[PDB]
């Protein structure tokens, strides 16, 4: 995360940390969100270069990447589902969403705690407005030109950007479609970055934190006129219900 502050999972207790196994400790690879006790949502691009469920391990309840955290829970991936129309197109990703069924060494799904909670999915519809300020979180880089990653969780606040604005040529032109969500900082100083992908974009809808987007792409980090782009979760609700329901 560029900008924002360092924080503890207790402030993003749906955050899921997805690592890849090694031939020998596992490598942090990207973020995700606990959308139900057995199911983590993330980005499909996180799994392409090796799409085998046995190669991944999911930790819930972590403030510090790649070390033990009190109240941590470690899960194997029972089932790995990538969207059927996932696709890379030279600038960006499309239909960039994945579902992971998680399970412990002893069979259990996620056990709630102050550091492990689920996050709500957006409603089909809702009347009554809400704010366009939404939260991001992850272990991504703190600046686009860093080598090296922070090792401790960070969080920040960005504003949603209208499709129309995001589609202006100065922004991302016709690469942006109705299945995507754009979010940036109005003064271009806080953003998600490399290593934040798959992680959540938390808006506050009908009074509760809501998973409105998944970190998918953007040119650099906190660059002027280059918002972060998120899978628009509300668009995939029926797809999500048909798999986890």
């Amino acid at each position: 995360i560029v900008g924002g502050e360092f924080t503890e999972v207790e402030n993003q207790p749906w955050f899921a940390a997805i690592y890849q196994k090694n031939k020998s400790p596992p490598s942090f690879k990207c973020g995700g969100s606990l959308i139900s006790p057995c199911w983590v949502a993330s980005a499909a691009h996180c799994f392409i270069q090796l799409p085998k469920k046995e190669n991944y391990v999911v930790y819930l309840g972590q403030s510090k990447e790649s070390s033990y955290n009190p109240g941590e829970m470690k899960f194997e991936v029972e089932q790995l589902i990538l969207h059927e129309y996932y696709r890379e197109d030279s600038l960006a990703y499309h239909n960039d969403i994945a579902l992971l069924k998680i399970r412990t060494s002893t069979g259990q799904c996620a056990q709630p705690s102050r550091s492990i909670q689920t996050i709500a999915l957006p409603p089909r519809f809702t009347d009554a407005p809400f704010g366009s300020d939404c939260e991001i979180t992850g272990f991504g880089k703190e600046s686009e030109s860093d080598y090296l990653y922070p090792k401790n969780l960070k969080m920040s606040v960005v504003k949603l950007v209208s499709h129309e604005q995001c589609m202006q040529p100065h922004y991302y032109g016709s690469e942006i479609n109705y299945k995507m969500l754009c979010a940036a900082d109005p003064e271009w100083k806080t953003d998600s970055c490399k290593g934040d992908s798959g992680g959540p974009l938390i808006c506050n809808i009908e009074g509760r934190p809501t998973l409105s987007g998944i970190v998918s792409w953007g040119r650099g980090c906190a660059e002027k006129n280059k918002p972060g782009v998120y899978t628009r979760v509300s668009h995939f609700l029926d797809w999500i219900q048909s798999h986890i329901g």
Partner: peptide
């Protein structure tokens, strides 16, 4: 990897 990726593996 598409150019505007924010993936650690790109």
């Amino acid at each position: 990897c598409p150019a505007y990726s924010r993936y650690i593996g790109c």
